[PDB]
Design a protein around this nucleic acid. Structure first.
Ligand SMILES: NCCC[C@H](N)C(=O)O
Ligand SMILES: [K+]
Ligand SMILES: [K+]
Ligand SMILES: [K+]
Ligand SMILES: [K+]
Ligand SMILES: [K+]
Ligand SMILES: [Mg+2]
Ligand SMILES: [Mg+2]
Ligand SMILES: [Mg+2]
Ligand SMILES: [Mg+2]
Ligand SMILES: [Mg+2]
Ligand SMILES: [Mg+2]
Ligand SMILES: [Mg+2]
Ligand SMILES: [Mg+2]
Ligand SMILES: [Mg+2]
Ligand SMILES: [Mg+2]
Ligand SMILES: [Mg+2]
Ligand SMILES: [Mg+2]
Ligand SMILES: [Mg+2]
Ligand SMILES: [Mg+2]
Ligand SMILES: [Mg+2]
Ligand SMILES: [Mg+2]
Ligand SMILES: [Mg+2]
Ligand SMILES: [Mg+2]
Ligand SMILES: [Mg+2]
Ligand SMILES: [Mg+2]
Ligand SMILES: [Mg+2]
Ligand SMILES: [Mg+2]
Ligand SMILES: [Mg+2]
Ligand SMILES: [Mg+2]
Ligand SMILES: [Mg+2]
Lengths: 48, 34, 103, 117, 110, 142
RNA sequence: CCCCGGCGAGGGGAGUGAAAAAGAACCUGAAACCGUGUACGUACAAGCAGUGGGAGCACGCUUAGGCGUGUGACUGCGUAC
RNA sequence: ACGGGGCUAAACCAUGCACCGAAGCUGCGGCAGCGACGCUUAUGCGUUGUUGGGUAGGGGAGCGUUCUGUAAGCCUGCGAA
């Protein structure tokens, strides 16, 4: 039990989505937004 | 106005140079797609 | 004197002392392989053509080396469609040295 | 935690330009043109691992056809005769015996002429 | 032994000096000096003073003899450029480059 | 083992002579293009000229079938505008009869630097005589 | 301090320093871009300039041979992102 | 207004047997996903069936960079970045 032998539980530290970082990531060039329209814009989207 | 140009500080209004319809040799017969 | 035999889905034309590169075999290095299914043996226009196999033809060989081949790079690309993927590959071989063409 | 890019981006650009050696003009000097030329060389190399297997079989067949007609038979009757005589030698070895052992090729033709007759 | 003389930041472009440096590459220095005397270029004046200085460096610092020296290497490199502004019509400004060059002459008796 | 390729410094080339009297034009030209290319040799290589030298005699006596002697038209353009020119088969035979065999064989050869070098081994004559006796051409009755 | 040069600019020696290719246009000194030298190719040859095959030449090896590196005649396929 | 050369068949009709022809199928070698059964696992291995073109997009698993702890440790002028 040292400061460099501790480890979190398996499955508790899922990594976050990083949009627009190349082809191999699967989220490049649109960030999961599709092509044009209101929902693809910065600040876009309709109200509740 | 273009007030902080470092390449050309002496001039602020420059579209008499490259915009074709603002040159002194522009003729309105060039705009015949009407 | 040469002979023709099949190994690894492919056919080879070998002489004694010649070192031949095959596909991977499950044989330790230094151990002797025998090839019983030989296709043709020729020795000074005394040509034994197998129908499909020369009856009693055996090629013995000595396993000299295993190893991986030179790396080939596999590049897939689809233009204007936001797709590419890359891949490397090295192929296993087995080097054998032909010891005897016993007709 | 500010990250600078200079060491990583230079090593990535230097890796592409090493694969672009020998290319003409901007294709071996300029990253925007060299990266584009390294990818097209990879699509060509994938495609020509398939065409290499077609071009050699095309070459073996034309050499068997030439050497069989030196013995009085065409390609399509020589292949039919070796199939009837149950000879399982492939075209790579047949085209090789046709160049280096012309007597042993004559023995195969007479084997194929016998099974047809 | 080789012997170098250089003129750095010479006020001419490298393309104009390289025409004169191609005349005397490989020549004996007796022959190369008289080619430069009767070449009607400004760059021929600049290359002659560098060749005359490489000759004098080889006699004084290296103990050579004049009748065996040849121009083994000669090359012109590009120096820094001076940026100048040139007014054009209708308010336009262009940028004038005033190109300099580095001249290098190597004389050797072998 | 790699497949054999013919090396151009060690290629055996032979000399033949063909009489073109009464032969059909195109059926003679396909055999000429085979042997100029080297398709009859087991050492055939697609980028090496492994063919033979062929002398063709009596080019003015080649035969065509049908009404082709007056109806086969040979076209060419000069490069100047309106400069399309034509000639019938009999006008070619009467003016320059070695060109009839040379045009037909050139269309059956590969296009490129190698096929232009294959064409150089074809020696066409209008008469019964040639002056290549020092090369000892063998009579090829094809 | 000596030498060339216009009592220049610039340079070559000498000297200082661990280092002067640390010389004041000064730590390190990448790339575009521009040169000199060497090996190979190239003046009958048509196109995204590569890729698959491949002769010859040059330089290294090491052998009773044919491998490594550079170049690439000729040839199949092939209209950038 | 056959792709060209050329063709009186190398055209058309009928019958027949060969051969060529793809990244289809088979052979040999390798990797991975999802099922099923097990030398027994402790969550990995073994046997077997099958699957693996892909945009928008959803899911899974990783590389590398700068900074903090482990680190008053470890490497380094016998040469770090
Ligand atoms: N009022 C006159 C200002 C002039 C200025 N340099 C311009 O180009 O506008
Ligand atoms: K989404
Ligand atoms: K330094
Ligand atoms: K510098
Ligand atoms: K540089
Ligand atoms: K090519
Ligand atoms: Mg993101
Ligand atoms: Mg996607
Ligand atoms: Mg949408
Ligand atoms: Mg868009
Ligand atoms: Mg839309
Ligand atoms: Mg906004
Ligand atoms: Mg909005
Ligand atoms: Mg003016
Ligand atoms: Mg004014
Ligand atoms: Mg010193
Ligand atoms: Mg020191
Ligand atoms: Mg310091
Ligand atoms: Mg510095
Ligand atoms: Mg530098
Ligand atoms: Mg030439
Ligand atoms: Mg010509
Ligand atoms: Mg057609
Ligand atoms: Mg078949
Ligand atoms: Mg296939
Ligand atoms: Mg296939
Ligand atoms: Mg398949
Ligand atoms: Mg997939
Ligand atoms: Mg599939
Ligand atoms: Mg730290
Ligand atoms: Mg670091």
């Amino acid at each position: 039990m040292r400061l460099n032998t501790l480890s979190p539980a398996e499955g508790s530290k899922k990594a976050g989505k990083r949009l627009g970082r190349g082809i191999g990531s699967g989220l490049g060039k649109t960030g999961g937004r599709g092509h044009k329209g209101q929902k693809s814009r910065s600040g876009g989207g309709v109200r509740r | 106005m273009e007030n902080n140009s470092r390449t050309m500080p002496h001039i602020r209004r420059t579209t008499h140079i490259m915009k074709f319809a603002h040159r002194n040799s522009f003729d309105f017969h060039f705009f015949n797609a009407r | 004197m040469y002979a023709v035999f099949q190994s690894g889905g492919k056919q080879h034309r070998v002489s004694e002392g010649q070192t031949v590169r095959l596909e991977k075999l499950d044989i330790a290095t230094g151990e002797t392989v025998e090839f019983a299914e030989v296709l043709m043996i020729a020795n000074g226009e005394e040509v034994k053509i197998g129908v499909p196999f020369v009856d009693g033809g055996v090629i013995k060989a000595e396993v000299v080396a295993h190893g991986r081949g030179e790396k080939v790079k596999i590049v897939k690309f689809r233009r204007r469609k936001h797709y590419r993927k890359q891949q490397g590959h090295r192929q296993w071989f087995t080097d054998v040295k032909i010891t005897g063409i016993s007709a | 935690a500010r990250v600078k890019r200079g060491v990583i981006a230079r090593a990535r650009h230097k890796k592409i330009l090493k694969q672009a050696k020998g290319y003409y003009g901007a294709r071996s000097r300029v990253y925007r043109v060299a990266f584009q030329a390294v990818i097209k060389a990879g699509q060509y190399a994938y495609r020509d691992r398939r065409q290499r297997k077609r071009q050699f079989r095309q070459l073996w067949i034309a050499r068997i056809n030439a050497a069989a007609r030196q013995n009085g038979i065409s390609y399509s009757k020589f292949i039919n005769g070796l199939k009837k005589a149950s000879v399982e030698i492939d075209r790579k070895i047949l085209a090789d015996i046709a160049v280096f052992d012309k007597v042993a090729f004559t023995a195969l033709v007479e084997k194929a002429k016998a099974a047809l007759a | 032994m080789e012997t170098i003389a250089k003129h750095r930041h010479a006020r001419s472009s490298a393309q104009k000096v390289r025409l004169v440096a191609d005349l005397i590459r490989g020549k004996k220095v007796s022959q190369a000096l008289d080619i430069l005397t009767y070449t009607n270029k400004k760059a021929a004046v600049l290359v002659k003073k560098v060749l005359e200085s490489a000759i004098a460096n080889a006699e004084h610092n290296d103990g050579a003899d004049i009748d065996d020296l040849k121009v083994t290497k000669i090359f012109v490199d590009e120096g820094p450029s001076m940026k100048r502004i040139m007014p054009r019509a209708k308010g336009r400004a262009d940028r004038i480059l005033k190109r300099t060059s580095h001249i290098t002459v190597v004389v050797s008796d072998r | 083992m790699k497949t054999f390729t013919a090396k151009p410094e060690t290629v055996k080339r032979d000399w033949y002579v063909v009489d073109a009297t009464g032969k059909t034009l195109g059926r003679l030209a396909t055999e000429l293009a085979r042997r100029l290319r080297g398709k009859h040799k087991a050492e055939y290589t697609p980028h090496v000229d492994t063919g033979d030298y062929i002398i063709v005699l009596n080019a003015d006596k080649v035969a065509v079938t049908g009404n082709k002697r007056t109806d086969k038209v040979y076209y060419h353009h000069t490069g100047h505008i309106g400069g399309i020119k034509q000639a019938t088969f009999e006008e070619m035979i009467a003016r320059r009869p070695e060109r009839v065999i040379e045009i037909a064989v050139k269309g059956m050869l590969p296009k490129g630097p190698l096929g232009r070098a294959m064409f150089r081994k074809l020696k066409v004559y209008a008469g019964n005589e040639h002056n290549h006796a020092a090369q000892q051409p063998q009579v090829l009755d094809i």
